[PDB]
């Protein structure tokens, strides 16, 4: 998990 507001991946 990435702390940054993940983009495209959206988890």
**DSSP letter string over the chain?**
--SS---SS--
- Structure determined by: NMR
Structure tokens, 10 = 């959206």
Query: Measured between alpha carbons, how far is 3 from 11 in angstroms, rounded to an integer?
Result: 11
- As a whole number of Å, the end-to-end CA separation of the chain is 7
The CA radius of gyration of the chain, in Å to the nearest whole number, is 6
Both structure tokens of 11: 């988890």
- In the numeric block, the tokens 């993940």 are attached to 6
What lies within 8 Å, CB to CB, of 11 at 6+ separation is 1
Biggest distance spanned by C-alpha atoms of the chain: 14
């Amino acid at each position: 998990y990435r702390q940054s507001e993940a983009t495209s991946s959206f988890g």
